Design a protein around this ligand. Structure first.
Ligand SMILES: [Zn+2]
Ligand SMILES: [Zn+2]
Length: 67
C-alpha cells in the first residue's frame, strides 16, 4: 500500500504526541502507548526506533505521573 498518510508530527495512531520514530515503518512517528501496544510483540527486533522530538505540539509541563 502507498496511497494514504504522509507523515504527521504526532503519533501516526492517535496523532496526539509522537515520542518515537520507527525506522522500519518508514520513520513512522509513534507514541509511548500505541507503540508499546503493538510494537512490543512483532519483529520489532529490527524496527529500530529513535527519540523523535516534534515542534512541542502537544507537549506537557509536569513530572512523572501514575494512574
Ligand atoms: Zn498513539
Ligand atoms: Zn514499525
Amino acid at each position: 500500500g502507498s496511497s494514504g498518510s504522509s507523515g504527521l508530527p504526532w503519533c501516526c495512531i492517535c496523532n496526539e504526541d509522537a515520542t518515537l520514530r520507527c525506522a522500519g515503518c518508514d520513520g513512522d512517528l509513534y507514541c509511548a502507548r500505541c507503540f508499546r501496544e503493538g510494537h512490543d510483540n512483532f519483529d520489532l527486533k529490527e524496527h529500530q526506533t529513535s527519540p523523535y522530538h516534534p515542534r512541542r505540539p502537544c507537549q506537557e509541563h509536569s513530572g512523572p505521573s501514575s494512574g
